[PDB]
Amino acid sequence: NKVTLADAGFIKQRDLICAQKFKGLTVLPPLLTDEMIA
C-alpha cells in the first residue's frame, strides 16, 4: 500500500496516465503473479 504503481498493463477501458497506449506504448504484465510471489 506504500508503493504507488503507475503501470499501464490492463484490459479495462477523465483519462488516466495510461493514455500512452494510444501512442503505441503498452505495458506487458509479469509472468509471476503477486499472489504467487507471496
Ligand X SMILES: *[C@@H]1O[C@H](CO)[C@@H](O)[C@H](O)[C@H]1NC(C)=O
| Position among 1, 2, 4, 22 found at the interface with another protein (CB under 8 A) | 22
Of residues 28 and 38, the one with the C-beta less far from another protein = 28
Q: Find all residues with CB under 8 Å of 27, minimum gap 6, and list them.
A: 7, 8, 9, 18
Tell me how far apart the alpha carbons of residues 20 and 24 are, in angstroms, rounded to a whole number.
7
Q: How far is the CB of 12 from ligand X (least distance, A)?
A: 5
Footprint on residues 2-21 left by ligand X (CB under 6 A): 11-12
| Position among 4, 15, 36, 38 found at the interface with another protein (CB under 8 A) | 15
